[PDB]
From TrEMBL:
CC per GO annotation: membrane
AB hydrolase-1 domain segment(s): 25-252
Alphabetized UniProt keyword annotations: Hydrolase
Lineage: Bacteria, Pseudomonadati, Pseudomonadota, Alphaproteobacteria, Hyphomicrobiales
Domain of life, source organism: Bacteria
Pfam families in the cross-refs: Abhydrolase_1 (PF00561)
UniProt entry tagged with the keyword Ribosomal protein: no
One annotated GO molecular function: hydrolase activity, acting on ester bonds
Protein name, per record: Alpha/beta hydrolase fold protein
Gene: aidH
Membrane-spanning parts: none
Keyword Hydrolase included in the entry's annotation: yes
Amino acid sequence: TINYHELETSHGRIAVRESEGEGAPLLMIHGNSSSGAIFAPQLEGEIGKKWRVIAPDLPGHGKSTDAIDPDRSYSMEGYADAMTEVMQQLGIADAVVFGWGLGGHIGIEMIARYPEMRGLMITGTPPVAREEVGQGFKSGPDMALAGQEIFSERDVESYARSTCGEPFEASLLDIVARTDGRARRIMFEKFGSGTGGNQRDIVAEAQLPIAVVNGRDEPFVELDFVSKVKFGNLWEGKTHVIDNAGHAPFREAPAEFDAYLARFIRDCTQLEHHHHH
């Protein structure tokens, strides 16, 4: 039922999964060391049945090749460039974008590159300036793995379990183990160095609807900090919290997460939204 295909891009060969939905398009961007396969509940469920869900693999991840040029590609802004190129190749200029973790940071960098984006939802993602990483994220061993090049077998399992939450599945180890570890190291260094656009300022000034949805028991993200971030156009006027979920509510609590995602897509595609400047 899922349409799997591969695109030759300037960054390398990028794997793409598409649902069968005939409705407005949604780009879902996976997180650090993950893959678009993680979005099975949306791809194969009611979201993907109605809307055209597009879930690619970032360069160095999943079934995509490693980046032709790691120095160009492995950064929040480089990934944003790659996803923008993917969408252009697919002929889709006005997707709603959902980004998970790293994918949410990528979505923020895409705002400048993809101006007809109809909305952005970020989950597991604190918009932070480089100097705010400590405020936005919780410190710990799995957080530290996010920027570590070489994963042992234990690291793979630890990172998979913590980032993906309940339930753990063996297939997650294959996804995380595949990841080009250079991508972790280089992206995290460039994030801390602010090589791309300041994400705090970007979300404050962005005019499109931005939705914020997180699991209450987030082990990586400081939810209080997130609830205080200034957004230009915060969807439904607040950040949203789902009980009995952590870093990955789209798989830990799919029904509740999907209620938010479906309503957000409906709003972004069915209501008027101006740009007053």
